[PDB]
Short mmCIF file of C-alpha atoms in Angstrom, two decimals:
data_model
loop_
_atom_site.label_atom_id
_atom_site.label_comp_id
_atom_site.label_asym_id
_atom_site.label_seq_id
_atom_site.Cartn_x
_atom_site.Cartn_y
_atom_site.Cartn_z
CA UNK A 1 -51.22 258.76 6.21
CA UNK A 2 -51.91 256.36 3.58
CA UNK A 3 -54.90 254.06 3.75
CA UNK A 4 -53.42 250.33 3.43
CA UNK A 5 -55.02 247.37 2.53
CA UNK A 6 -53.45 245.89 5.53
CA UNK A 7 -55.10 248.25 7.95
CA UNK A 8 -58.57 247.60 6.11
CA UNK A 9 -58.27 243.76 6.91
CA UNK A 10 -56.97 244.51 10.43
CA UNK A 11 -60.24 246.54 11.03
CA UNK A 12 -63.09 244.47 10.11
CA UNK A 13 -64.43 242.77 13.03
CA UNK A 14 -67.55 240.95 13.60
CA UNK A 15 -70.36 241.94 16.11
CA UNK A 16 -70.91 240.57 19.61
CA UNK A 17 -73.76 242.08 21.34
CA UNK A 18 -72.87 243.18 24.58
CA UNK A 19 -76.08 242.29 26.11
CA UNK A 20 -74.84 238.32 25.08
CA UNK A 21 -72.98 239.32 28.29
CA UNK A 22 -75.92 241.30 30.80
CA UNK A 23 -78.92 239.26 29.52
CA UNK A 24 -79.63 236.13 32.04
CA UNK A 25 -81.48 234.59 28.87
CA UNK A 26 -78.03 235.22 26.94
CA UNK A 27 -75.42 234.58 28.98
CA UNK A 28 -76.07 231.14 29.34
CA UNK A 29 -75.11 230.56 26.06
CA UNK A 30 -71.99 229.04 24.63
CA UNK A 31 -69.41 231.06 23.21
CA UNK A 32 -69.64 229.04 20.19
CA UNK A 33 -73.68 229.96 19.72
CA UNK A 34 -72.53 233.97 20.87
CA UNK A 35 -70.12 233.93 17.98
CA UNK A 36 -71.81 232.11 15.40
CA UNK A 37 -74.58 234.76 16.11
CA UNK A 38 -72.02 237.62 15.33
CA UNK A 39 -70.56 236.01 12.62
CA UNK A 40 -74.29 235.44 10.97
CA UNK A 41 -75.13 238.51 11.45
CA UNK A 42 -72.01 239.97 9.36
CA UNK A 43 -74.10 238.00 6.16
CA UNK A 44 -77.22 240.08 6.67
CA UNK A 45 -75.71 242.49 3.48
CA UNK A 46 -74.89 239.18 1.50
CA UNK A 47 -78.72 238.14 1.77
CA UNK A 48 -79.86 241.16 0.17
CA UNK A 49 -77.79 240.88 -2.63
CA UNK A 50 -79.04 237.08 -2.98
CA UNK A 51 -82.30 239.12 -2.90
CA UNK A 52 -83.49 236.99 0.47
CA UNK A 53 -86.02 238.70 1.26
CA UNK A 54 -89.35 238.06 2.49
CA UNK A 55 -92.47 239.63 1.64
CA UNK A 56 -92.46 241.75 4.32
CA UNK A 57 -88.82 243.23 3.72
CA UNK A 58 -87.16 240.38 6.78
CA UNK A 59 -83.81 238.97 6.04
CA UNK A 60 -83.42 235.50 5.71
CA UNK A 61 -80.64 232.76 5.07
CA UNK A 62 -81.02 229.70 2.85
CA UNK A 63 -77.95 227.55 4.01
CA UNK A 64 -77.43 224.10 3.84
CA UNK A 65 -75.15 221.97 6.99
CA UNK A 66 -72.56 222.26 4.78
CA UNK A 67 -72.80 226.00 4.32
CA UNK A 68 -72.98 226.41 7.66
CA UNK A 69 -69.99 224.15 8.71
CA UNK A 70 -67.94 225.99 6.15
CA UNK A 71 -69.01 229.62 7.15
CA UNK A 72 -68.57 228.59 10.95
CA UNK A 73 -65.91 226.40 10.70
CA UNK A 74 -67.36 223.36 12.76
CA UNK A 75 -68.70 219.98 12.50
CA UNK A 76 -72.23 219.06 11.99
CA UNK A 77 -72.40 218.05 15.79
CA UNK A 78 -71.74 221.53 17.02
CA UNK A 79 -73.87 223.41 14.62
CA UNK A 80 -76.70 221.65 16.00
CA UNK A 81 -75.98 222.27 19.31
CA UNK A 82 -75.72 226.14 17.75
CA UNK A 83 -79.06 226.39 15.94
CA UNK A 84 -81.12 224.75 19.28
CA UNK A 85 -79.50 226.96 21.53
CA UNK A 86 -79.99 229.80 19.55
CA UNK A 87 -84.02 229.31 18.58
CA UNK A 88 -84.37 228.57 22.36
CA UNK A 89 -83.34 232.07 23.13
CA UNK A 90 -85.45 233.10 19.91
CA UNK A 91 -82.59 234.66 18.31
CA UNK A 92 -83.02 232.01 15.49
CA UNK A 93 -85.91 231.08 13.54
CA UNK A 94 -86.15 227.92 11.30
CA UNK A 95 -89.34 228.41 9.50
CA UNK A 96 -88.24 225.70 7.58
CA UNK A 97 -83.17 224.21 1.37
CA UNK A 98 -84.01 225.19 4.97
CA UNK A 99 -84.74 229.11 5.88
CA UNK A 100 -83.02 230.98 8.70
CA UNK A 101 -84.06 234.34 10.37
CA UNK A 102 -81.66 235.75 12.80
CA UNK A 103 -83.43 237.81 14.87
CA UNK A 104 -82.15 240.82 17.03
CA UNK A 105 -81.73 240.12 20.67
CA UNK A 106 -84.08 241.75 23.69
CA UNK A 107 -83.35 244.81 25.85
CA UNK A 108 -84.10 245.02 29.55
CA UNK A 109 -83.68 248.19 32.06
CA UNK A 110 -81.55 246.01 34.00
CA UNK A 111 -79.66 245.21 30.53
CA UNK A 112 -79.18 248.98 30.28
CA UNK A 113 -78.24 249.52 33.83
CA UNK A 114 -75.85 246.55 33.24
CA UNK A 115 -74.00 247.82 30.04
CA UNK A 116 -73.69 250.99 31.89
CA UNK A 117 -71.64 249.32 34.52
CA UNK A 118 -69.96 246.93 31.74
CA UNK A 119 -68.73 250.14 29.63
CA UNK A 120 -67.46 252.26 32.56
CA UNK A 121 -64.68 252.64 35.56
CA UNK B 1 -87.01 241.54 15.82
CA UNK B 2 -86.42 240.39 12.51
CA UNK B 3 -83.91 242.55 10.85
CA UNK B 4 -85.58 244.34 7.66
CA UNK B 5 -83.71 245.62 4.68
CA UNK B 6 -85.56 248.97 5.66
CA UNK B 7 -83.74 249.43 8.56
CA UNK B 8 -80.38 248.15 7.02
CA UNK B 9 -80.39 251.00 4.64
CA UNK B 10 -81.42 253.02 7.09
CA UNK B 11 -78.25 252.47 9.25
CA UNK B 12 -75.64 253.01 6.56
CA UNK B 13 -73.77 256.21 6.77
CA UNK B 14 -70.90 257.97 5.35
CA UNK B 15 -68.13 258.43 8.78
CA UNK B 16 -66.83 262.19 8.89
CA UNK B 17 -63.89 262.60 10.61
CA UNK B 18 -64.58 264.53 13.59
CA UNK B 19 -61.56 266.26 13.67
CA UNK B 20 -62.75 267.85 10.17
CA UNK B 21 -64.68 270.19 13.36
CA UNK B 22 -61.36 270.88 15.73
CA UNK B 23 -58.11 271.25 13.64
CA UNK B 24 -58.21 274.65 12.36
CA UNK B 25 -55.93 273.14 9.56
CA UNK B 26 -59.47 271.63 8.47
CA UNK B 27 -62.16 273.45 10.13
CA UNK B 28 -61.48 275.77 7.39
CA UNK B 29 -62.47 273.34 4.91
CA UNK B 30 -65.98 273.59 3.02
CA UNK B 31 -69.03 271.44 3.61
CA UNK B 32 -68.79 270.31 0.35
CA UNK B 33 -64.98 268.94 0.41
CA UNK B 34 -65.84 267.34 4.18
CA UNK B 35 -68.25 265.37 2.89
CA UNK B 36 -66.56 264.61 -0.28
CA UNK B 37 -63.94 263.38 1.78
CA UNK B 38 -66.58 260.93 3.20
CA UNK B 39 -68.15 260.08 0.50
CA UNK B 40 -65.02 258.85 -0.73
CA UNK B 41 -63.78 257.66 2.62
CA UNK B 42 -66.99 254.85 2.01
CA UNK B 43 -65.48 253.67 -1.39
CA UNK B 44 -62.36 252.16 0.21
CA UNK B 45 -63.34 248.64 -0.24
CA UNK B 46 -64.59 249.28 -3.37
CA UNK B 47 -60.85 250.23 -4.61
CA UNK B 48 -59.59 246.93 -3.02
CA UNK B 49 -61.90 245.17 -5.36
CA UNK B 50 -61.27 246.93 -8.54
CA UNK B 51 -57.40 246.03 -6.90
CA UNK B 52 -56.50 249.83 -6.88
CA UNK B 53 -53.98 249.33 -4.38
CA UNK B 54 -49.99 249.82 -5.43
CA UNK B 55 -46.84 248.24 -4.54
CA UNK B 56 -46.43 248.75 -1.19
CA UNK B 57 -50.42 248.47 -0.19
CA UNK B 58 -51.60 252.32 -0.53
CA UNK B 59 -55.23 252.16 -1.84
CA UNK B 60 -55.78 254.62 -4.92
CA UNK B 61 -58.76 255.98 -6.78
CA UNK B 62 -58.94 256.24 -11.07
CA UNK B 63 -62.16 258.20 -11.28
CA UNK B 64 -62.60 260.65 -14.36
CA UNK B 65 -64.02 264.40 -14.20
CA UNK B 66 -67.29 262.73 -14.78
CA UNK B 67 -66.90 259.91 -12.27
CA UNK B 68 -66.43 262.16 -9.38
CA UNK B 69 -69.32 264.06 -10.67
CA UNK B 70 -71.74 261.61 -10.09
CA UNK B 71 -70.14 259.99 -7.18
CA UNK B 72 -70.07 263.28 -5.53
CA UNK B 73 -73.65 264.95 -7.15
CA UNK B 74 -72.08 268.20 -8.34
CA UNK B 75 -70.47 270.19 -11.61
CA UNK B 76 -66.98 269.76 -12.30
CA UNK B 77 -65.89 273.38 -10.89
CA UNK B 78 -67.42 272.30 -7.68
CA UNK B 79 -64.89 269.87 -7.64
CA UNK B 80 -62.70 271.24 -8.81
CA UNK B 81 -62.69 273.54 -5.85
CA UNK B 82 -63.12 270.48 -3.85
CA UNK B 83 -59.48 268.52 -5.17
CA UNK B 84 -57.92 271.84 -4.36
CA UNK B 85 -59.48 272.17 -1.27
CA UNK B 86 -58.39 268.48 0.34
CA UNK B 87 -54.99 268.82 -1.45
CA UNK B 88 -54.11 272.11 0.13
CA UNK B 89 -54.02 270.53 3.47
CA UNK B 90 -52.99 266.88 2.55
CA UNK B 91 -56.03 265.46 2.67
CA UNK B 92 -55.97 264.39 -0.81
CA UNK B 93 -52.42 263.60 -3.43
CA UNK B 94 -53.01 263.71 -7.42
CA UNK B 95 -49.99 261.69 -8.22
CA UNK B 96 -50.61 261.88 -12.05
CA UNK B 97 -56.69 258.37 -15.90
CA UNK B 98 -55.87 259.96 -12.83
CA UNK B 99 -54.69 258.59 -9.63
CA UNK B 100 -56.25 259.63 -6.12
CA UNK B 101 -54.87 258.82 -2.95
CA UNK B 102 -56.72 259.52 -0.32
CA UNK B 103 -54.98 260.55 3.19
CA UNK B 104 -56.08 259.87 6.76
CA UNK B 105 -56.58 263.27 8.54
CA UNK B 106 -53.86 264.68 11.35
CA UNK B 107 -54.20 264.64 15.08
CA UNK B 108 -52.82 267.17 17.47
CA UNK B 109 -52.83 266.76 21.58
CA UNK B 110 -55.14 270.26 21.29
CA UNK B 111 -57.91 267.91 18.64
CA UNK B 112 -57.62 265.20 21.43
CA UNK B 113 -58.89 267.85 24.22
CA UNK B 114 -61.29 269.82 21.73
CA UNK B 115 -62.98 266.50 20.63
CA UNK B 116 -63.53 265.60 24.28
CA UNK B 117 -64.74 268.83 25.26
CA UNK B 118 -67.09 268.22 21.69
CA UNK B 119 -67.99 264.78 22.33
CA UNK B 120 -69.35 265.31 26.10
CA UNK B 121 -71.71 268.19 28.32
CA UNK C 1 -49.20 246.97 16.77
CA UNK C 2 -49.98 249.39 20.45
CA UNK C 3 -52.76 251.27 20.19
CA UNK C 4 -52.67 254.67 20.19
CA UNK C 5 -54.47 257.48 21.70
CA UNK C 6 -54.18 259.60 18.19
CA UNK C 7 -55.21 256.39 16.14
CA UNK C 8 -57.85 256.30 18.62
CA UNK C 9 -58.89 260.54 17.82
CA UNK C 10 -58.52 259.42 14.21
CA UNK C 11 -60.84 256.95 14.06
CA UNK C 12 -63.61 259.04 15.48
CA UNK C 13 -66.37 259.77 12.61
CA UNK C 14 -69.58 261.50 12.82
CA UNK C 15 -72.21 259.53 11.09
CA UNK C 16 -73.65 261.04 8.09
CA UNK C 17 -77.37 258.70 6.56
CA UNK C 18 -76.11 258.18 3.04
CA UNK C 19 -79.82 258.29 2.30
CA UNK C 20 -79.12 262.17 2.61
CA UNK C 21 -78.27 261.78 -0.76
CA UNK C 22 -80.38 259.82 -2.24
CA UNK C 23 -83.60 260.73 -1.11
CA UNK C 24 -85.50 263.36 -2.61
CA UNK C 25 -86.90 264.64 0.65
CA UNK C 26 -83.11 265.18 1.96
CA UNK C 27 -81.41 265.49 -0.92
CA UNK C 28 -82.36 269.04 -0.72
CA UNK C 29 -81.46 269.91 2.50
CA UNK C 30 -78.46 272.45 2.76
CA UNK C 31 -74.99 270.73 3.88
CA UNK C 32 -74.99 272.75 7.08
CA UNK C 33 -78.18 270.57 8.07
CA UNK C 34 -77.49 267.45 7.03
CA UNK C 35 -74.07 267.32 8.89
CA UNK C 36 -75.51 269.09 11.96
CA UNK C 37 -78.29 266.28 11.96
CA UNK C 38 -74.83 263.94 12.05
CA UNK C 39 -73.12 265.98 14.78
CA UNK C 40 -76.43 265.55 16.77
CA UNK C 41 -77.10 262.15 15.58
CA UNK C 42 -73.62 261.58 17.94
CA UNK C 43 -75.05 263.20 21.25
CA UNK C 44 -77.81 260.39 21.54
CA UNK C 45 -75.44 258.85 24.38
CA UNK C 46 -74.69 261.78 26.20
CA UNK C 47 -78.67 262.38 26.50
CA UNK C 48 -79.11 258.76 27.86
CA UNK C 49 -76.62 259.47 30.35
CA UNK C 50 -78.68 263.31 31.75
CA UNK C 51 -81.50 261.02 31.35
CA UNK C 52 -82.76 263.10 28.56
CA UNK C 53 -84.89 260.15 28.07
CA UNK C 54 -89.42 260.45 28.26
CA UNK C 55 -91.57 258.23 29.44
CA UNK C 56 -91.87 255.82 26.41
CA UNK C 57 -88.42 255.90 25.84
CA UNK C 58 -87.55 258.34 23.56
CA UNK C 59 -84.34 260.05 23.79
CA UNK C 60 -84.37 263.82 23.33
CA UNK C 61 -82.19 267.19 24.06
CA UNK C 62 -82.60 270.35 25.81
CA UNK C 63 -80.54 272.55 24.55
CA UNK C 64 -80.52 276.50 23.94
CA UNK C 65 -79.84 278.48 21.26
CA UNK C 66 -76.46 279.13 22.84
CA UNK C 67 -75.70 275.15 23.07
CA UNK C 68 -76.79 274.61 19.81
CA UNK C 69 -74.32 277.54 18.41
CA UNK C 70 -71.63 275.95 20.21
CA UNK C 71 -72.01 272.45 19.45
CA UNK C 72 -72.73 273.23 15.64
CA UNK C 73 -70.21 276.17 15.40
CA UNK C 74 -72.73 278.69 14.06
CA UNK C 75 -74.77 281.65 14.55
CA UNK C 76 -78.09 281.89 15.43
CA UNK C 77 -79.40 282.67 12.02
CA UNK C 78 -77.72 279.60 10.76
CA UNK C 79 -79.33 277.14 13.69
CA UNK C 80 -82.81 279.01 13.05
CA UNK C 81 -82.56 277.74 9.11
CA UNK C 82 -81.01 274.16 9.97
CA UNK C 83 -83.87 273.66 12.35
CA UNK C 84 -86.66 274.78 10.07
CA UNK C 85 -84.63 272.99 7.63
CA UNK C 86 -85.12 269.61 9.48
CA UNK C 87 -88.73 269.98 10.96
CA UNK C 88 -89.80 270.45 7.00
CA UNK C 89 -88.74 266.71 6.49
CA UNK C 90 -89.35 265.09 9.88
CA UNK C 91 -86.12 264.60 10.72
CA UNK C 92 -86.50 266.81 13.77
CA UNK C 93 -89.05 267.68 16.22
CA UNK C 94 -89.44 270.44 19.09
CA UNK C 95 -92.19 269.76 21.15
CA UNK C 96 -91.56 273.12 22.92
CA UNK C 97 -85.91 274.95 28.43
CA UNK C 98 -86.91 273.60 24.40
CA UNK C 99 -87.14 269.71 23.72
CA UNK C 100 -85.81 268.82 20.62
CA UNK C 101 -86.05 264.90 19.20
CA UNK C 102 -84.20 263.79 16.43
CA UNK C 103 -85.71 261.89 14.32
CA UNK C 104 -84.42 258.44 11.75
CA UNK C 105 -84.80 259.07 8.28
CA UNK C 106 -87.02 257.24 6.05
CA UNK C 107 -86.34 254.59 3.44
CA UNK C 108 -87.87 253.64 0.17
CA UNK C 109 -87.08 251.19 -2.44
CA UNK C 110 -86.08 253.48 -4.70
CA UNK C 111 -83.79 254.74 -2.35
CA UNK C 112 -82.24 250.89 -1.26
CA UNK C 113 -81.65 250.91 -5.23
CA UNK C 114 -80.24 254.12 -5.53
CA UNK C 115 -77.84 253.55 -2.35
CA UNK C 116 -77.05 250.10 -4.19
CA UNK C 117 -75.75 251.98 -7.10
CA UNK C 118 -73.96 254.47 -5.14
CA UNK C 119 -72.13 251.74 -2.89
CA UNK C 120 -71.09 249.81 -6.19
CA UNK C 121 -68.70 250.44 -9.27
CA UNK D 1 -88.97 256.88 13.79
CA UNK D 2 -87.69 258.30 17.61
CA UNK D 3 -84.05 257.03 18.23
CA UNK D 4 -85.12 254.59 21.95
CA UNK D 5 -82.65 254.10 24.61
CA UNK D 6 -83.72 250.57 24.08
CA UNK D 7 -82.63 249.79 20.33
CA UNK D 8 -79.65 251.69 21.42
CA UNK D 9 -78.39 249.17 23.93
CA UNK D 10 -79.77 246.84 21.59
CA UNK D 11 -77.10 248.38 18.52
CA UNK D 12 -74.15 247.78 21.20
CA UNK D 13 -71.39 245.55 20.02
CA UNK D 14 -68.00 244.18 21.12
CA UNK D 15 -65.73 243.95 17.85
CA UNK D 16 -64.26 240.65 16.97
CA UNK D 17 -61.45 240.69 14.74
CA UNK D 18 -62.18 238.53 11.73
CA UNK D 19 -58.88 238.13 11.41
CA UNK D 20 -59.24 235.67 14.50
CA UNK D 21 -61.10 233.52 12.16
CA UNK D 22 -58.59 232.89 9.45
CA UNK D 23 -55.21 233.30 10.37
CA UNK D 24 -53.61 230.56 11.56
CA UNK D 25 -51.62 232.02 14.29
CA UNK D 26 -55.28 233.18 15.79
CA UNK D 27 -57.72 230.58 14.80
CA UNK D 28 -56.10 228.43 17.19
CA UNK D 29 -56.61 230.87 20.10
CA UNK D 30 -59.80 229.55 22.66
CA UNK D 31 -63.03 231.47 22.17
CA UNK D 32 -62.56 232.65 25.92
CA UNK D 33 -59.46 234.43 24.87
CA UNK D 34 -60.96 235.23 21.29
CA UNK D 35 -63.93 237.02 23.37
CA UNK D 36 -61.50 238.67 25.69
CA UNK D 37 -59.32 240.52 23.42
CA UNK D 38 -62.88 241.98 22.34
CA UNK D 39 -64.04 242.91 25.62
CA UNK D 40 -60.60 244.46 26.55
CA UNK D 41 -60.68 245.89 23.07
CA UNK D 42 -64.00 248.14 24.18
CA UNK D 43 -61.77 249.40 27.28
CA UNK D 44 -59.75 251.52 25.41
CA UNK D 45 -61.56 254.86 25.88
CA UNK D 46 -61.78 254.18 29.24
CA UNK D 47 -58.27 254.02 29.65
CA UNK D 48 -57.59 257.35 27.83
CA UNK D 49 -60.05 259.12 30.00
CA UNK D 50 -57.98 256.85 33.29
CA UNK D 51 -55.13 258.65 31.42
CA UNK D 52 -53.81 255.33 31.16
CA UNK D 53 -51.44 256.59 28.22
CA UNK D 54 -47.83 256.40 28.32
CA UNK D 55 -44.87 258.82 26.91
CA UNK D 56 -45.41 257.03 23.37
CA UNK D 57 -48.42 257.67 23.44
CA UNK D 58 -49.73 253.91 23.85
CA UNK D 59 -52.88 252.76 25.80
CA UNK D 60 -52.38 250.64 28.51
CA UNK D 61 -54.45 248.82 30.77
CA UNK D 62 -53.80 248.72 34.84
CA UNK D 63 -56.12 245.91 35.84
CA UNK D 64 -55.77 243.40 39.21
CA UNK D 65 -56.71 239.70 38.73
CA UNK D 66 -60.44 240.16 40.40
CA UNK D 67 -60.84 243.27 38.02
CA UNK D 68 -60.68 241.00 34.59
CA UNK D 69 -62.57 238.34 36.67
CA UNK D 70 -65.38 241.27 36.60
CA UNK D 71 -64.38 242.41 33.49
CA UNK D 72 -63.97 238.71 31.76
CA UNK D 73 -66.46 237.03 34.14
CA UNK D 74 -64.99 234.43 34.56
CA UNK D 75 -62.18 232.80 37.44
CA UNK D 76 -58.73 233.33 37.85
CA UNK D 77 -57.79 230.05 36.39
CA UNK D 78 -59.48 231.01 33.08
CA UNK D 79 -58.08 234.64 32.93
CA UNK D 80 -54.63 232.87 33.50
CA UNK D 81 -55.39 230.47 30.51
CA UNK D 82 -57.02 233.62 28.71
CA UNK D 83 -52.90 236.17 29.19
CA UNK D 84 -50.59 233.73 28.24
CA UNK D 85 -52.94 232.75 25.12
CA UNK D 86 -53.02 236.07 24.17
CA UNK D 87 -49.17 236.79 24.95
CA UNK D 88 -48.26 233.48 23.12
CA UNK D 89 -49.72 235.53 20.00
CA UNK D 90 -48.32 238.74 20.58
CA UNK D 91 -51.97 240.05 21.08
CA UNK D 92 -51.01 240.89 24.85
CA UNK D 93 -48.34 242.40 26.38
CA UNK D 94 -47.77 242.15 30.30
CA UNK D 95 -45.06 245.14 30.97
CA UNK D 96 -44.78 244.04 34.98
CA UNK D 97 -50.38 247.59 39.75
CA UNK D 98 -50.05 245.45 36.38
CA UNK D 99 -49.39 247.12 33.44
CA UNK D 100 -50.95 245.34 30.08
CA UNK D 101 -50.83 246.81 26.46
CA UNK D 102 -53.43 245.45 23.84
CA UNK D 103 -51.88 244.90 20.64
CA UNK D 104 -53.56 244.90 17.10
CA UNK D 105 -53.52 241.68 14.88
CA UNK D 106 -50.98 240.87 12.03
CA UNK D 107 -52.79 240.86 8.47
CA UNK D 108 -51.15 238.56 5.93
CA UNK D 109 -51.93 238.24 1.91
CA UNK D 110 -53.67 235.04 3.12
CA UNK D 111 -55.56 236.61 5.60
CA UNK D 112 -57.39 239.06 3.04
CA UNK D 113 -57.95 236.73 0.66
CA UNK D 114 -59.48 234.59 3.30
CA UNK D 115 -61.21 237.06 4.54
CA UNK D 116 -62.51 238.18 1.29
CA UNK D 117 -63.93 234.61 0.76
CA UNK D 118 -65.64 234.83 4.30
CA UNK D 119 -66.95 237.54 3.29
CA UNK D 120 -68.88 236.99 0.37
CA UNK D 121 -71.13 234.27 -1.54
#
């Protein structure tokens, strides 16, 4: 009944978002672009400790190809195929030492209906 | 769409075991020493940093009468009530710059079928 | 390495805003309140499912006074002062077979500062 | 500041193990059968409330090859490539009306302080 440091590790995951998996716009994506999202998204807390943050309070990323190839694990060739596919489902936005938004994904009442049928019997 | 620091710290909570509301071991318990539980539940990973974790993995706390008194926003007979409280039922072990080990609550077949009956119509 | 069906009752939390402590709005509110905003908080799902949901989207909860004492474990003197309790701060509205919406809490940059110190060493 | 059926969906994740992402036994594993073990990972309340649990009280999956082609989306062949990935690991166990068992990750030294790295600056 102790808490380990083993079972901390063991229970940090990143997030998909299910609708990545209902969404026509989404689905199409790669699993490469689907992960990178959740694994970007896991950095949102890191940016507002490196205090990026835009005027209006929206969380951004300042990462180079590097950063990203490092943080994703993946060549240069793929993370470009990531980023495109990404801001063509505007769930990325390169307002371009470059600047990254993620941005949250949409909902739909089929989406809904979907996940309903995704989380059950 | 963009994700805002606002609503970042507005989606941070402190997780209280449910079955704090079902064992009677624990229903018992007072408000303030179920939410000092998870209150210090939340500063896990902080121990892991500060490497607070012994020999075989078990994650401790080293927090003065003074620490837990502003971690937890309340005198020191508060918690002292509070220690006593979570020890009594083995929530909580002062192995005596005190050490703290917190414990992960217990589950019977009857908390199982109460937090069902809790957790739906 | 299985899981477990009592890992599984273990791991279920109620979710508790830490800006309930932070906040000089909430801050005040009585523990009773604050958690039963949390055990609430939990029951969002179960609404979408009776399609407890209004025209706009909103998801709300008809419940008695008899629910309500259930569900929180409490008399009806207690419920009357949680729910005046949260209508004084907004986190809870009853737009009178009652509707009640729960509301988010607010967040100011005081308290993103003050939940930075309270996540930290 | 009224909690929408909409950003609910929206705030609906599958959980990927990070772990999957720095040890070496898992990095290795296909993002098909990375994104599987998360999907499966979601079913687990379902199979409680199937009363999929056995005398151990471990959670078990009964699921026919079209079901994980639902469930997966995805053919036969894949789902075939996605098992023996996952048993190869010791993520999946297939205890021969199928009978799988989900297993949790291993957590090494390595894989924390990897993980610690991934997780900040």
């Amino acid at each position: 009944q102790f808490f380990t440091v083993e079972e901390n590790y063991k229970e940090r995951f990143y997030q998909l978002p299910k609708v990545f998996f209902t969404n026509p716009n989404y689905k199409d994506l790669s699993n490469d672009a689907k992960i990178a999202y959740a694994i970007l998204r896991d950095r949102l807390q890191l940016s507002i400790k490196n205090n990026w943050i835009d005027t209006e309070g929206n969380i951004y990323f300042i990462y180079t190809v590097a950063d990203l190839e490092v943080i994703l694990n993946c060549g240069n060739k793929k993370i470009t195929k990531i980023k495109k596919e990404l801001e063509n489902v505007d769930l990325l936005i390169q307002k371009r030492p470059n600047l990254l938004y993620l941005l949250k994904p949409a909902i739909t009442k089929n989406d809904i209906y979907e996940i309903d049928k995704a989380e059950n019997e």
